Amino acid sequence: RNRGRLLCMLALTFMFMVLEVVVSRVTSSLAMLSDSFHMLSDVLALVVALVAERFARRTHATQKNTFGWIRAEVMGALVNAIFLTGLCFAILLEAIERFIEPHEMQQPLVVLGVGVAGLLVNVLGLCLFHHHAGQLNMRGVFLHVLGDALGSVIVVVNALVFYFSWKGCSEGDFCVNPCFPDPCKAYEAGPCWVLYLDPTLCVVMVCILLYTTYPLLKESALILLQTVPKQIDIRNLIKELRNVEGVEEVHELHVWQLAGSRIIATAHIKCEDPTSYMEVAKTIKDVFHNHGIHATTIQPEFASVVPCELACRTQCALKQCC
Amino acid sequence: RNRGRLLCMLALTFMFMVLEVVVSRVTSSLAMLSDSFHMLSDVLALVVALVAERFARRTHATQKNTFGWIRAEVMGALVNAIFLTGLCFAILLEAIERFIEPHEMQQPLVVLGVGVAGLLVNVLGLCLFHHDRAGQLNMRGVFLHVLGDALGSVIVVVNALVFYFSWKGCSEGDFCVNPCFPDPCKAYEAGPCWVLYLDPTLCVVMVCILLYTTYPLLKESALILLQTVPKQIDIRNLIKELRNVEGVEEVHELHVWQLAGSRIIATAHIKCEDPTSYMEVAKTIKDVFHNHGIHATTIQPEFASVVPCELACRTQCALKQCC
Ligand SMILES: CCCCCCCCCCC(CCCCCCCCCC)(CO[C@@H]1O[C@H](CO)[C@@H](O[C@H]2O[C@H](CO)[C@@H](O)[C@H](O)[C@H]2O)[C@H](O)[C@H]1O)CO[C@@H]1O[C@H](CO)[C@@H](O[C@H]2O[C@H](CO)[C@@H](O)[C@H](O)[C@H]2O)[C@H](O)[C@H]1O
Ligand SMILES: CCCCCCCCCCC(CCCCCCCCCC)(CO[C@@H]1O[C@H](CO)[C@@H](O[C@H]2O[C@H](CO)[C@@H](O)[C@H](O)[C@H]2O)[C@H](O)[C@H]1O)CO[C@@H]1O[C@H](CO)[C@@H](O[C@H]2O[C@H](CO)[C@@H](O)[C@H](O)[C@H]2O)[C@H](O)[C@H]1O
Ligand SMILES: CC(C)CCC[C@@H](C)[C@H]1CC[C@H]2[C@@H]3CC=C4C[C@@H](OC(=O)CCC(=O)O)CC[C@]4(C)[C@H]3CC[C@]12C
Ligand SMILES: CC(C)CCC[C@@H](C)[C@H]1CC[C@H]2[C@@H]3CC=C4C[C@@H](OC(=O)CCC(=O)O)CC[C@]4(C)[C@H]3CC[C@]12C
Ligand SMILES: CC(C)CCC[C@@H](C)[C@H]1CC[C@H]2[C@@H]3CC=C4C[C@@H](OC(=O)CCC(=O)O)CC[C@]4(C)[C@H]3CC[C@]12C
Ligand SMILES: CC(C)CCC[C@@H](C)[C@H]1CC[C@H]2[C@@H]3CC=C4C[C@@H](OC(=O)CCC(=O)O)CC[C@]4(C)[C@H]3CC[C@]12C
Ligand SMILES: CC(C)CCC[C@@H](C)[C@H]1CC[C@H]2[C@@H]3CC=C4C[C@@H](OC(=O)CCC(=O)O)CC[C@]4(C)[C@H]3CC[C@]12C
Ligand SMILES: [Zn+2]
Ligand SMILES: [Zn+2]
Ligand SMILES: [Zn+2]
Ligand SMILES: [Zn+2]
Ligand SMILES: [Zn+2]
Ligand SMILES: [Zn+2]
């Protein structure tokens, strides 16, 4: 039911975006107009997750992809992780700008209400996405929703502090502080500890998001690159492969995984005599069993002049595998 | 080489960042310093390309990567393409924001000069980057990333020139204020309003062109990392030619995929009739694979029906076998 949760969250994002646009139009606040389009990024993340899930629904050999689209979910997870990292850097740059150029919010009450609505939406999204292969895509979506929830917590706390520990002027009163620039060059009621509360909270949220996102990005990149899974030791596999009767040379051992538990192995063997190859093949498959290998393709090279006899004419092109 | 070009572009980017920082310090135009900080996007793109180029040369097998890190270049190209797409979406969002509300530029002269310097730097970068496919994929990604900011600098220069030549300023307190832009504190612009919306429309056209030119690279990188059979290899024809040899009666699981550039790996299961004189047909299947772009193969003969493959696990789990 992965598609159901994604569709529900996407529908909620649309409803909350429409609510924010309506609130902005009725209150004629341009900041809410600006913030309404900021969830196009979340909508894009949900669309990418949905596309990856839909394309991973099919796993069949095709004239375009022999393996099928099994690697669609890991690609979607990688795309979501990169998008989240880019968003984190963008909001970090925005936080630096806020440090350099502080802003003063308008109507803290409506901002607090919007933040509370967003916080409820985000916490129920976490309730849907806490996971009550395909988990990596769900993990990336959950990380994105958690980043949105942290942003909502930040805006709620910022609005609460600005409403409880700040005092501005509603008219031309004498409270101008030269810390913030004034238009055309224009007291102690409103301290400066609040204007800088939003940027520091944003920086902390950026650090938390990067901390919790780095493992997902690392795993997605390691899957997309042809890396042996961390649960498989190459040295032990080689040791058990050479300790097999009838086989003495094992070259071209390439081990990698497509997605999830679909680990694929490939090796060449010098299997002594041709007639008794079949008995050795079952032992080789069993040996792959003790490890985590299952997809296999073993080449029984028969006959020290050359390591691999079935090699091509010229490999100087480096067009091979390793 | 290629690493030297990346180091040179990184040095130029850092020099331009220093130039914009000092210009902002001596001018107090904080938008210039904001753009200097934005150049961290180019810094990050060049750093990613540098890391990919450094790690791609480790072609030898490793205890953690049996294939080696020769997939690093294509992964770096994919990362740069996704970063460029995200930057393009951010630019389009900013253009929509400018439609929502415009801004008045403080001083067209210094921003025009900074834009000219950026245009020259980006033109030098384009000259560097215009001239294995995997090595070229990273080069093309960096070239597109440079061209995006080159177009951005061109937009800045054009807007500055038009704003200076064809707009009327309003600084001193007078009747020159117009509600076209919001008036702080509740407050006749003889300059045409056509200029207030020159950054956004040009940025929209630029992002359209950038997305159009970055779609092919992103698609190619995604296809390579999705184990898509290369477009120059036909699976059906290769199956038909493999089944034409005398010693093979049936082939299953012709897993063909592209590793990087011109490295295609094909693993196939064939059913040979007899172990005697088997090497006669192994040479033929290797040759017929060579007849195409596949040079690194691995074939498993199966000597023996109802079952499709006589070698399989005890459970034949559909979630643990390939395809
Ligand atoms: C973020 C997640 C990324 C991973 C997930 C996506 C990975 C890519 C998906 C592969 C992909 C794009 C590749 C290029 C863009 C890659 C962008 C990557 C960007 C990464 C950031 C291959 O592209 C297609 O491949 C087909 C097979 O080679 C072939 O066309 C073939 O279909 C033509 C149909 O019109 C047809 O006319 C032509 O005759 C065919 O031969 C063409 O090559 C091409 O159309 C698209 O998927 C393909 O298209 C359909 C999709 O739903 C899907 O069609 C089915 O349902 C349709 C319902 O309406 C309807 O048509 C049919 O019921 C059925 O056909 C295909 O089954 C699927 O395979
Ligand atoms: C945009 C595309 C980017 C693609 C990048 C592809 C390349 C990735 C390179 C990183 C990576 C692959 C894993 C992926 C990480 C995340 C990657 C990014 C993911 C998101 C995209 C391999 O790379 C490591 O990097 C080393 C430093 O450069 C280098 O070693 C250099 O050493 C000399 C000194 O420098 C130099 O003289 C020599 O010449 C180099 O050999 C080797 O290449 C390698 O060891 C890291 O893997 C492992 O990470 C471990 C710590 O987690 C850590 O392991 C260690 O454990 C013990 C100590 O705890 C120690 O006892 C082990 O011995 C050791 O193993 C190592 O780091 C590495 O084993
Ligand atoms: C949003 C896009 C455009 C960028 C995504 C972030 C990258 C800039 C990051 C993500 C993962 C990072 C890599 C993670 C791990 C390593 C291994 C690291 O190697 C070590 O130093 C190992 C330890 C040692 O040798 O002491 C070198 C940096 C590198 C390649 C990092 C380089 C920067 C990377 C690619
Ligand atoms: C240096 C610039 C480019 C910023 C990079 C991101 C930062 C926000 C830092 C702050 C805290 C860092 C994290 C703190 C510690 C770790 C250790 C490690 O993950 C763990 O926590 C494993 C256990 C351990 O801490 O050793 C991998 C990197 C990570 C997540 C770090 C990744 C980079 C983070 C998120
Ligand atoms: C999400 C994006 C912004 C990337 C953030 C992290 C990166 C800036 C990379 C670049 C270099 C990386 C570091 C390179 C070397 C190491 C040593 C490495 O040491 C170990 O393996 C100790 C055991 C352990 O991992 O617990 C731990 C990861 C760490 C800190 C890496 C953490 C991730 C780093 C900081
Ligand atoms: C988070 C962002 C930055 C990632 C990059 C942008 C993606 C949202 C885009 C880039 C390429 C797009 C894909 C390009 C091509 C297609 C094929 C398309 O299917 C067809 O056109 C096939 C024929 C048919 O219509 O049936 C379905 C959408 C899809 C997967 C697109 C989904 C959205 C993608 C992944
Ligand atoms: C959705 C909003 C936020 C941005 C919209 C930007 C558009 C102006 C861009 C985005 C992607 C672009 C498309 C990306 C890919 C192609 C394919 C390109 O060639 C083809 O039709 C097939 C190419 C092939 O098969 O290699 C023609 C332009 C087109 C439709 C582009 C037209 C312009 C598009 C729609
Ligand atoms: Zn061999
Ligand atoms: Zn090899
Ligand atoms: Zn078979
Ligand atoms: Zn060859
Ligand atoms: Zn098994
Ligand atoms: Zn298969």
Residue numbers in the entry:
A (entry chain B): 6 to 137, 240 to 293, 306 to 422, 429 to 447
B (entry chain A): 6 to 136, 238 to 293, 306 to 422, 429 to 447
From the paper:
Here we determined four high-resolution structures of the plasma-specific hZnT1 and the synaptic vesicle-specific hZnT3.
A global 3.48-Å resolution map was obtained for hZnT1 purified without EDTA treatment, which allows unambiguous modeling of most regions except the intracellular histidine-rich loop (residues 138–240) and the C-terminus (residues 448–507), owing to their intrinsic high mobilities. ZnT1 dimerizes tightly through the intracellular CTDs, the six-helical bundle TMDs, and the extracellular cysteine-rich linker that connects TM5 and TM6. The extracellular half of TM2 tilt towards the neighboring TM3, which creates a hydrophobic interface mainly through aromatic and aliphatic residues. Interestingly, the sidechain of His43 on TM2 is not confined in the vicinity of Asp47/His251/Asp255, the highly conserved HD/HD tetrahedral zinc coordination network among ZnT/SLC30 family. Considering that the cytosolic labile Zn2+ concentration ranges from picomolar to nanomolar, while the binding affinity between free Zn2+ and TMD region is measured at the micromolar level with purified ZnT/YiiP proteins, our Zn2+-unbound outward-facing ZnT1 conformation may reflect the post status when zinc ions are expelled out of the translocation passage. ZnT1 SCD1 is overlapped with SCD1 sites found in ZnT8 or YiiP proteins, the peripheral SCD2 is composed of residues from both protomers, and the third Zn2+-site (SCD3) is close to the TMD/CTD nexus.
